[PDB]
């Protein structure tokens, strides 16, 4: 598990 990836595009 990881913190939600924070870059969307």
């Amino acid at each position, epitope marked *: 598990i990881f*913190e*939600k*990836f*924070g*870059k969307g*595009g």
Partner: antibody
Amino acid sequence: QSVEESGGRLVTPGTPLTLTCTVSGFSLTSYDMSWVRQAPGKGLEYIGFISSTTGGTYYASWAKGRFTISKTSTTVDLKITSPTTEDTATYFCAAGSWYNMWGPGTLVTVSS
Amino acid sequence: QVLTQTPSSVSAAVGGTVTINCQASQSVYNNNWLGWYQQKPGQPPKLLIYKASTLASGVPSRFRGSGSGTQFTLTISDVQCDDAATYYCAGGYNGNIFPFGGGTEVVVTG
């Protein structure tokens, strides 16, 4: 449309200082807002950013504690909590998930 | 957690071709979270390529991005004096890790 950093100045080691990033022609919250620095003659180094998707603030592992990122009504701010000689650099702010739009940079000089 | 950018310096004559490589220690996010930037001395960086292979608006077609997973490539065809700069890759990983590569100087020879 532009981003502009401010706050670069000469400080003695240990003197805290805050840089600001101001956006023109779009909203502070529309896009990822990042702080990157570049020591003289060296490479780019990511410090941290505020996500437009999660709303969260993230730091590079090396930068945790050394920098604090916060926002006002009109700026994204970077506080250098206890500057060292090694923090002498140009600080850039950038908008967009891909660092799409960069400011000109503001220079921090840490010396006596 | 590290992007290894090679070589450190590269030369082409005007009209030549340059290759710059970026190797991740593990797979980047979604196998394609890798961007390429150009920086001239005294100026901020400019985005060239995002999502490994997408050209940014206004960027010349002679800049091409390729690769996926751990291995990425920027090529410059028909090299111009204007292309003399430092180029950086920048990647993204699960865990919100966003390293820059260490940069490649391009010297345009004649």
